[PDB]
Design a protein around this ligand. Structure first.
Ligand SMILES: CCc1nn(CCO)c(CC)c1Oc1cc(C#N)cc(C#N)c1
Lengths: 557, 412
């Protein structure tokens, strides 16, 4: 049918007019197919013959699908699409299974010949003009135009969507306690009614839809659980990921590892513990797709650990609006975090992992906070509420960090859970100068042209040292200088630098870095017992800084 | 009750806003549905089709001394693409000088004036759904919307009529309209002041807008807090070094600053804890600088063609410092914010309070909101700001990593 729904007024972009793309001359066979296909469509009101007036045209083509000798009509709307107004956006997200509420009875109903059952604005149909050419550019071809939403036109997905929303509204009002999910041409229905009433409510729905030009499958034609939906396997009381097969292979290509990471990231939605970090590392630099990449010892271990996890089929449970959501997080390793969300201890609605920030100098407290943030956002999206957190960090550790850090931070309601490895700060800078501790005045310089540099210090105990560095930057020398002072100092040290840069990094109590150097410094800071770090402006009559600036600057402009 | 609508126009070339809707909690979605289905019945808004490709974010807040959900539309994009907002509202310089200023929400007035038919499309917004089960509920405005700078610009004519009698009766009172609010300042005793506000609400009342003892500001008692120089008997190298740095920095703001005498003390590679007696000379320079720091800052002037910028630093102990300028260091205003009894455990809560306060002061002083540099993670701010937000407006903001020194320079 063709829905009796009011049409959506459509228009072309401001300073633009309809398409006028000439018809390619087509084969005798292809022309025959188009004629019959179009005759059928015309008989169903999907299209209509037009006069010679209409100056618009869009190319038409015909292709036959294999294992069958049945032709299909392809319209190239690339041009009309560039000229068609922008629309809304169908949806901002796809439902996640974990967010599906528990309902005793669920039915899937798909809207049949979807796009073709919806009318197109009459004032816009003129722009959908296409031409079946005559055997060898004889005379005018048979010219048609759409009356319904054309397959492959820009506004079809959105217009269909709206039409369905308008159609479902009255039924929604009269049945507030029934859930309907709109997805493309599909329609999922859930209720907490015992079959009997439910099949009745379904039937009533279909009748409401049919009364509006939309065909659906009848009972015996409806799909039955499991439902293979967008990568998922849906059962009435549990869900999981579509069967994942990890290819047993000798020699892996970039393409193979890429697909592997894909499946793994995908499986991470319900299978806890999946680690992908070591595989991603192999994908660095890549330069090719067919090039084989030898697996590191670490990747082989990671892959093996993943297989173990995937050997045992895991399932997710559905959402109960009456119960609280609980999210638990654990540290898997270097910048690796996993989490799980449940309502009833250990009956997971969903799983996930976190591994951001490319080592821009961070610590476990910052990372944990980031993971909490990410989980909080998805919870709001999926369930409309934030979960209660279970974190492997002491309230004391948390308060100490937050109160003293420069950035505002805030975790929703959480509870400590003794699940090692626990999160902690590995070292802490002193708040005031250490009495009876050697004072190192450090500094570093680097020539912009030659990239050559010097790093060193001078103490109050009269010590001195200056190292030469090659292929360096000002930043690197400043960090080198601090590293030097930490190496030659021992348990208690006062260090005075002129680098806001280094002060900034160290003050944030990092425990991980992409910089081999910063790691040296961290490793060294952990060994100390007491460390005080101060800053002074450079190029000033400031005793100490004024002097290291000499030996470090000499020979390096 | 339509009238002759004021034809609105986007900037040439500029196109309508297409800002994504951020996920909302079920609680807030429920509240917005209830509110919107009521505004629809009143004809203030109406459903729209997919042929409307525009979108503006929507949230739900609660003002202070208010336990009833309110709709807050974030028109920041549309506002930037509008102006028009052409015939602006002049900012009185007397406002910042009043003994007291009262803020009154007059947003309910805007729903009387119909919005230009050809502009409505640009006011589109979405009420999202949980787990994206349902497609969003889409609407647009038929009347002047709250939050859009175009509304007060258009409503000026009617606002001046409403306030004419009250103005002639109290020609010494200053009335400034900014977005959905009215700023009312007088030099009167607090008792008369409050009485005059009450009278003003009656005038507004006669025009259908119930304008509820609102927040009371005292711009007179606003004094730019200095940079602060210590006061100790004995000083260490560390303290002088900390002082040299601080002044070295401030010298970039106030030209009159000197540091040569103090720096003279810092010579040789001494231990940080060593005590150092200050020369009588350094004493003067020091005292002389403190005097300079007491007074404003010679040379900085508000430029109405340039944007206002505000930086905030977390000082700890519920304390926050901030600076307002158009060009770095050229501070037009500096201040402080201490957590009010309650937020004793929330950084985001305090920061949102501090932002609203600073924004309010900006409106009073310049009649403009500053662009904020927030010491927080975007996603965190994005996730929580609405939880404690109570203003009808929303300033522009960006996220930054506070330079550790800056905190000290302004530390108190
Ligand atoms: C109300 C819709 C619904 N709820 N539940 C939870 C049952 O307790 C399930 C699992 C079977 C549903 O079915 C879908 C089937 C398909 C398919 N095909 C897709 C979605 C979605 N979203 C949902």
């Amino acid at each position: 049918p063709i829905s009796p729904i009011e049409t959506v007024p459509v228009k072309l972009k401001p300073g633009m007019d309809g398409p006028k793309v000439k018809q390619w001359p087509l084969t005798e066979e292809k022309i025959k197919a188009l004629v019959e296909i179009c005759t059928e469509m015309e008989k169903e009101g999907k299209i209509s013959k037009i006069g010679p007036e209409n100056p618009y045209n869009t190319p038409v083509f015909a292709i036959k699908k294999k294992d069958s000798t049945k032709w299909r009509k392809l319209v190239d709307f690339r041009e009309l699409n560039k000229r068609t107004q922008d629309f809304w956006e169908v949806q901002l997200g796809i439902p996640h299974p974990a967010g599906l509420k528990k309902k005793k009875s669920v039915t899937v109903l798909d809207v049949g010949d979807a796009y073709f059952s919806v009318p197109l604005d009459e004032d816009f149909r003129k722009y959908t003009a296409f031409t079946i050419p005559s055997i060898n550019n004889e005379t005018p071809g048979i010219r048609y135009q759409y009356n319904v939403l054309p397959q492959g036109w820009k506004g079809s997905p959105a217009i269909f969507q709206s039409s369905m929303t308008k159609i479902l509204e009255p039924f929604r009002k009269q049945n507030p306690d029934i859930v309907i999910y709109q997805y493309m041409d599909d329609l999922y229905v859930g209720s907490d009614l015992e079959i009997g009433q439910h099949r009745t409510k379904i039937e009533e729905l279909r009748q409401h839809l049919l009364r509006w030009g939309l065909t659906t499958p009848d009972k015996k034609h409806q799909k039955e659980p499991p439902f293979l939906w967008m990568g998922y396997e849906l059962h009435p009381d549990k869900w999981t990921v579509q069967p994942i097969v990890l290819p047993e292979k000798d020699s892996w290509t970039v393409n193979d590892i890429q697909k592997l990471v894909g499946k793994l990231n995908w499986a991470s939605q319900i299978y806890p513990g999946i680690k992908v970090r070591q595989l991603c590392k192999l994908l660095r630099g890549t330069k090719a797709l067919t090039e084989v990449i030898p697996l590191t010892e670490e990747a082989e271990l990671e892959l093996a650990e993943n297989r173990e996890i995937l050997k045992e089929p895991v399932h997710g449970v559905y959402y109960d609006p009456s119960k609280d959501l609980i999210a638990e997080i654990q540290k898997q390793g270097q910048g690796q975090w996993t989490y799980q969300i449940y309502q009833e201890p250990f009956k997971n609605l969903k799983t996930g992992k976190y591994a951001r920030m490319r080592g821009a100098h961070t610590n476990d407290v910052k990372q944990l906070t980031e993971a909490v943030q990410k989980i909080t956002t998805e919870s709001i999206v999926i369930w409309g509420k934030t979960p209660k957190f279970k974190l492997p960090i002491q309230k004391e550790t948390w308060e100490t960090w937050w109160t003293e850090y420069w950035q505002a931070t805030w975790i929703p309601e959480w509870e400590f859970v003794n699940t090692p490895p626990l999160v902690k700060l590995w070292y802490q800078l002193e708040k005031e100068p250490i009495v009876g501790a050697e004072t190192f005045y450090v500094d570093g310089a680097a020539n912009r042209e030659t990239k050559l540099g010097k790093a060193g210090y001078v103490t109050n105990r009269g010590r001195q040292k200056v190292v030469t560095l090659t292929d360096t930057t000002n930043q690197k020398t400043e960090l080198q200088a601090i590293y030097l002072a930490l190496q030659d100092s021992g348990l208690e040290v006062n260090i005075v630098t002129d680098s806001q840069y280094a002060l900034g990094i160290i003050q944030a109590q990092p425990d991980q870095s992409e910089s081999e150097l910063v790691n040296q410094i961290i490793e060294q800071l952990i060994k100390k017992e007491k460390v005080y770090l101060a800053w002074v402006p450079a190029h000033k009559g400031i005793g100490g800084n004024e002097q290291v600036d000499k030996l470090v600057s000499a020979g390096i402009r | 009750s339509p009238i002759e609508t004021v034809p609105v126009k986007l900037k040439p070339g500029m196109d309508g806003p297409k800002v994504k809707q951020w996920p909302l909690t079920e609680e807030k979605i429920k509240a917005l549905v209830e509110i919107c289905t009521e505004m629809e019945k009143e004809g203030k808004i109406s459903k729209i089709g997919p042929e409307n490709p525009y979108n503006t974010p929507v949230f739900a807040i609660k003002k202070k001394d208010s336990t009833k959900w309110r709709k807050l539309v974030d028109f920041r994009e549309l506002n930037k693409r509008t102006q028009d907002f052409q015939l602006g509202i002049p900012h009185p310089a007397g406002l910042k000088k009043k003994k007291s200023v009262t803020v009154l929400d007059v947003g309910d007035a805007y729903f009387s004036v119909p919005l230009d038919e050809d502009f409505r499309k640009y006011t589109a917004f979405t009420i999202p759904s949980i787990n994206n089960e349902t497609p969003g509920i889409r609407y647009q405005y038929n009347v002047l919307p709250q939050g859009w700078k175009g509304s007060p610009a258009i409503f000026q004519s009617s606002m001046t009529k409403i306030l004419e009698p009250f103005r002639k009766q109290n020609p010494d009172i200053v009335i400034y309209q900014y977005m959905d609010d009215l700023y009312v300042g007088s030099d009167l005793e607090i008792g008369q002041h409050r009485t005059k506000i009450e009278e003003l609400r009656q005038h507004l009342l006669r025009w259908g807008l119930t304008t509820p003892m609102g927040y009371e500001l005292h711009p007179d008692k606003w004094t730019v807090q200095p940079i602060v120089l210590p006061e100790k008997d004995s000083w260490t190298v560390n303290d002088i070094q900390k002082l040299v740095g601080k002044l070295n920095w401030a010298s970039q703001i106030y030209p009159g600053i000197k540091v040569r005498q103090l720096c003279k003390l810092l010579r040789g590679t001494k231990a940080l804890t060593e005590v150092i007696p200050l020369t009588e000379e350094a004493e003067l320079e020091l005292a002389e600088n403190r005097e300079i720091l007491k007074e404003p800052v010679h040379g900085v002037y508000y430029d109405p063609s340039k944007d206002l910028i505000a930086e905030i630093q977390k000082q700890g102990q519920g304390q926050w410092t901030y600076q307002i300028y158009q060009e770095p260091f050229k501070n037009l205003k500096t201040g402080k914010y201490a957590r009010m009894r309650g937020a004793h455990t929330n950084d985001v809560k305090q920061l949102t309070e501090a932002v609203q306060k600073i924004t309010t002061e900006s409106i009073v002083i310049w009649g403009k909101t500053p662009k904020f540099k927030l010491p927080i993670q975007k996603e965190t701010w994005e996730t929580w700001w609405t939880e404690y937000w109570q203003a009808t407006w929303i300033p522009e903001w960006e996220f930054v990593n506070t330079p550790p020194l800056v905190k000290l320079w302004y530390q108190l």
